[PDB]
């Protein structure tokens, strides 16, 4: 689990969005596994606006943060799960590292701020849903 709070927005994995997230829906993209809902309170997370390929992500299944090198956002095939059939997920970044289903929502950070959130895992790889291109999150 986990979310990003910036301005009047809450960014979560689309497959983990709650009834309240859907009742306050701003934007959602199934191909990216992203959902954004509106919030009453102000968020103070800073979104990174960069092309970094190194950062640190939080891994709840280990209660640890890990420094990782990660690929640029792209269309990557993702195996079927109880949330989605087998499909290509867009804006996804891969790194070598530990990830279990409950790790989705862990934030990936670089020197500039929030890069994205854990969205896929398995085979010793961790995938992150990029959020750096969503410039509207800051207004
Ligand atoms: N973005 C998605 O489509 C994800 C939806 C939740 C399940 N997904 C995973 O990759 C989680 C996982 C981790 C480790 C081993 N197996 C798993 O299934 C896919
Ligand atoms: Zn950066």
UniProtKB/Swiss-Prot annotation:
Binding-site positions, Zn(2+) 1: 50, 52, 110, 112
Catalytic residues of the enzyme: 15, 33, 104
Substrates-to-products reaction catalysed: Selective cleavage of Tyr-|-Gly bond in the picornavirus polyprotein
Top-rank taxon, per record: Viruses
Quaternary state and interactors: Homodimer.
Function: Cysteine protease that cleaves viral polyprotein and specific host proteins. It is responsible for the autocatalytic cleavage between the P1 and P2 regions, which is the first cleavage occurring in the polyprotein. Also cleaves the host translation initiation factor EIF4G1, in order to shut down the capped cellular mRNA translation. Inhibits the host nucleus-cytoplasm protein and RNA trafficking by cleaving host members of the nuclear pores. Counteracts stress granule formation probably by antagonizing its assembly or promoting its dissassembly.
Name of the featured protein: Protease 2A
Residue numbers of the full-length protein present here: 869 to 1007 of 2193
